[PDB]
Design an enzyme around this catalytic site. Structure first.
Site, PDB file in Angstrom:
ATOM      1  CG  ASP A 198      -1.962  -1.216   0.936  1.00  0.00           C
ATOM      2  OD1 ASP A 198      -2.311  -1.502  -0.243  1.00  0.00           O
ATOM      3  OD2 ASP A 198      -2.256  -1.926   1.902  1.00  0.00           O
ATOM      4  CD  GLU A 252      -3.203   1.643  -2.206  1.00  0.00           C
ATOM      5  OE1 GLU A 252      -2.383   2.062  -1.351  1.00  0.00           O
ATOM      6  OE2 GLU A 252      -4.430   1.564  -1.953  1.00  0.00           O
TER       7      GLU A 252
END
Ligand code: CA
Length: 555
Positions: A198, A252
């Site tokens: 992330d 991400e």
């Protein structure tokens, strides 16, 4: 052979809203474990679970206080180890979120770090002297205000790109990188075989922390993705960790320009395996993040096309229409009115399962779950709505009714209402009171009803997944958009080893006549939805019903 992950079908579980097994209203690990036969039957190869680590939960579990312990609300470590054993028994894989741009401020590293200037954890984070009687520089936070927070204990400020309670980890410190790598192996050695990094583009910070220029202040997110050691660190992580496992890694990626996506995913660079980008899912979102902007299928397909192109020969993309932060796929991209919900949900399934990339199905989209009928701002859990209320309603820019109308269409809570298992109380998600209300449409839309019905949205997803599994072109084949300008019918080819398939999806709730490229002819029909008869062999055109979809082999 191509890597396993290029032909896998993934399913995203947000465990909090998947299945509760102890009646506290919160979905848990045992609930996911009990539903593995359901997911295996659908055809799922791998499940991506949202953050499952020990967390004070100030930011939906993305504020992690111990990377080697589980989220208490989901169960125990033994529950997690049972989940892994049950996945292995079924030949299924697990992907987890990895949140290592920052930790919780309750992580023991940060408690140690902040306690004094002279301790072996000081450099696990970024501590700087302020300047001119305030912050070290003009850096803004993604969550508002300064990215620098002063700590009275030492008089210095710490960096947080995201929330104040999410101090950024210092990747410039080799000891910290080594801690992170050992942490990843802890999970990989338990059998985890996917990791989704992330906010991966923000890991490297700019040496010296100079002020952002005025131009940079206007897009600080881009500036924070340009740390000069970013790709060096991802390459190191690949050498130290991922060279030793068959796991898939995904980044991400946001903030960065599109043209930098290949730096993360080009296989030759030995960084990450695949990309999550948000161009498509945000393609009709206004800048304020709560309104929508009108778009057509031409915009939808052109957005898919530019991301497919940027992955190119050596990179690889994920594909999704839904996740835990966004409105429901059928509501957002299809038509969720009663006449069209099932038809359009099936059409979006055909798109999902025939895109070039690794598809991720968000929990419940296989049923055609829809947005939730919010009636009042009081019905939202969504922390973002409270912020929009302060920023737009209290300031007089919008009324509370305007906010409700629009955030009902865009709020992440649309994706977080509990999974609709059956028509018992609270759709069989819980024996207690669910943490967020179940959509009253569960009496019609639920897995129990759909699994028994060959004509359901569930059955169509299952059938598509079976077809995709048996047709290599539909996973690893080339992709060609036949007419990016066409705003009525999405038509494209997938081709591999001399076999070419044609996908045709009507995005209009009206009949449309579709003419194949001159010289192309239908050889076989693999599957259709909303169609009363397949074309004849040799057909050079199709008459499409409203929202019809189909996959054809061409001659
Ligand atoms: Ca529970």
């Amino acid at each position: 052979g191509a890597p396993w992950w290029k032909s896998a079908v993934f399913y995203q579980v947000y465990p909090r809203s998947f299945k509760d097994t102890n009646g506290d209203g919160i979905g848990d690990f045992k609930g996911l474990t009990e539903k593995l036969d359901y997911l295996k039957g659908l055809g799922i190869d791998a499940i991506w679970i949202n953050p499952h680590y020990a967390s004070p939960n100030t930011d939906n579990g993305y504020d992690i206080s111990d990377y080697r312990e589980v989220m208490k609300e989901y169960g125990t470590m033994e529950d997690f180890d049972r989940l892994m054993a049950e996945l292995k028994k079924r030949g299924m894989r697990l992907m987890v979120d990895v949140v290592i741009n920052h930790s919780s401020d309750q992580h023991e590293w940060f408690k140690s770090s902040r306690a004094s200037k002279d301790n072996p954890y000081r450099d696990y984070y970024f501590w700087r002297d302020g300047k001119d009687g305030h912050e070290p520089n003009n850096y803004p936070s993604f969550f508002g205000g300064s990215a620098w927070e002063k700590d009275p204990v030492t008089g210095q400020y710490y960096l947080h790109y995201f929330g104040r309670q999410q101090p950024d980890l210092n990747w410039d410190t080799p000891k910290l990188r080594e801690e992170l790598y050992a942490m990843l192996r802890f999970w990989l050695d338990k059998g985890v075989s996917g990791m989704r990094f992330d906010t991966v583009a923000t890991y490297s910070k700019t040496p010296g922390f100079p002020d952002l220029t005025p131009e940079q202040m206007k897009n600080f997110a881009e500036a924070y993705t340009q740390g000069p050691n970013l790709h060096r660190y991802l390459q190191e992580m690949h050498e130290k960790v991922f060279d030793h496992y068959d796991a898939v890694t995904a980044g991400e990626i946001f903030g960065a320009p599109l043209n930098q996506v290949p730096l993360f995913i080009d296989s030759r660079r030995k960084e990450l395996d695949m990309a999550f980008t948000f161009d498509l899912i945000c393609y009709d979102r206004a800048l304020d993040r709560w309104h929508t902007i009108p778009r057509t299928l031409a915009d939808f397909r052109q957005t898919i096309d530019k991301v497919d192109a940027i992955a190119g020969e050596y990179g690889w993309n994920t594909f999704f229409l839904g996740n835990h932060d966004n409105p429901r796929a059928v509501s957002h991209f299809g038509d969720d009115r009663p006449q069209w919900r099932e038809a359009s949900a099936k059409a979006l399934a055909t798109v999902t399962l025939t895109q070039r990339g690794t598809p991720f199905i968000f929990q419940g989209d296989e049923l055609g779950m829809t947005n939730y009928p919010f009636k009042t701002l009081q019905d939202f859990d969504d922390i973002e709505v409270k912020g929009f209320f302060q920023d737009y309603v209290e300031t007089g820019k919008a009324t509370a009714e305007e906010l409700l109308t629009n955030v009902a269409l865009t709020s992440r809570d649309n994706a977080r209402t509990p999974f609709q298992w059956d028509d018992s109380a609270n759709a069989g998600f819980t024996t207690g009171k669910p943490w967020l209300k179940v959509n009253p449409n569960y009496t019609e839309i639920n897995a129990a009803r759909e699994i028994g019905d060959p004509k359901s949205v569930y059955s169509f997803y299952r059938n598509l997944i079976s077809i995709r599994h048996e047709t290599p072109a539909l996973s690893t084949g080339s992709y060609r958009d036949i007419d990016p300008s066409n705003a009525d019918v999405y038509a494209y080819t997938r081709s591999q080893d001399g076999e070419t398939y044609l996908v045709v999806v009507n995005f209009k709730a009206e009949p449309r006549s579709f003419t194949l490229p001159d010289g192309m002819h239908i050889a076989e029909t693999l599957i259709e939805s909303s169609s009363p008869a397949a074309p004849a062999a040799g057909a050079a055109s199709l008459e499409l019903q409203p929202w019809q979809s189909g996959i054809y082999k061409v001659k």
